[PDB]
Design a protein around this ligand. Structure first.
Ligand code: FRI
Ligand code: FRI
Ligand code: ZN
Ligand code: ZN
Lengths: 122, 123
């Protein structure tokens, strides 16, 4: 299917954007890296299907906030938003968050692993 | 003697402090441990005498920086610093020699735990 190729490329682009954000974070100087690891993110309890991307969508505003403190973030997050919303679509899904919060590093990596998990199935 | 007893206790204190930190790191979750293991440390080529503790002293700030990412580290490293300064004591300033291969936090701490244990057991 042609639409399956659309889902694939969109997942590849989202994976790349998250990898790019993380790459810049890994190169931060010691005092800067320390301060951004205090910014807490909500994590998914389950992330095996495309509908679970609602957990990412809801956490894009904190992500835009964290990137603003460490610096364009407004434009980059808006681009990711479009892809995230398009990738999940049916009506409205309630997202279940884990008890323990994580840092930007664990947050990004989880969603990077999520994207890699779906790409391989199609 | 009263001089050797003090040296023994202070060496056993440094050993305990490093073992306390090592217990903290090993207790971390797998994903947290992964990022902790990328923080690289400088290792001593020769560590046989009390004056070789300068290779630990210089690496004490990098240790504080690592525990700040995993976060009190400001007071604990300061406490360790005092011990090192009292043990290496003297007025002699020994210039340090470092090995080529860098090591993780676990390998760094264990090497100095090993250093402590070896000095204690020969006095
Ligand atoms: C000298 C010079 O200019 N150079 C220089 C270079 C770098 C730096 C360091 O940069 C920074 C400086 C400051 C910060 C920072 C962080 C913060 C805090 C960290 C903690 N915060 C948070 O965790 C906010 N998150 C939420 O609201 C959560 C809470 C929920 C989990 C309960 N909600 C959701 N995720 N949905 C709030 C923001 N502030 C106010 N400032 C950050 Cl994140 C960086 Cl990266 C400083 C100076
Ligand atoms: C759970 C999960 O997946 N994420 C997750 C969640 C939270 C945490 C909290 O703890 C941490 C979180 C993140 C990090 C971390 C650190 C780092 C880097 C690792 C590489 N760095 C270094 O090279 C540090 N080393 C030095 O500065 C050396 C240089 C030497 C190599 C020549 N200096 C001297 N010895 N003189 C700089 C810091 N990143 C990119 N991420 C670290 Cl080290 C810890 Cl301990 C860790 C991981
Ligand atoms: Zn805020
Ligand atoms: Zn003590």
């Amino acid at each position: 299917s042609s639409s399956t190729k659309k889902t694939q490329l969109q997942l590849e682009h989202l994976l790349l954007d998250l990898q790019m954000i993380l790459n810049g974070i890994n190169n931060y100087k010691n005092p800067k890296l320390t301060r951004m690891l205090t910014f807490k993110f909500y994590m998914p309890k389950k992330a095996t299907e495309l509908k679970h991307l609602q957990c990412l969508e809801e956490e894009l505003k904190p992500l835009e906030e964290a990137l603003n403190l460490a610096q364009r973030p407004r434009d980059l997050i808006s681009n990711i938003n479009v892809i995230v919303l398009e990738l999940k679509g049916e009506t409205t899904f309630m997202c279940e968050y884990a008890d323990e919060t994580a840092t930007i590093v664990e947050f990004l990596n989880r969603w990077i692993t999520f994207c890699q998990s779906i790409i391989s199935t199609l």
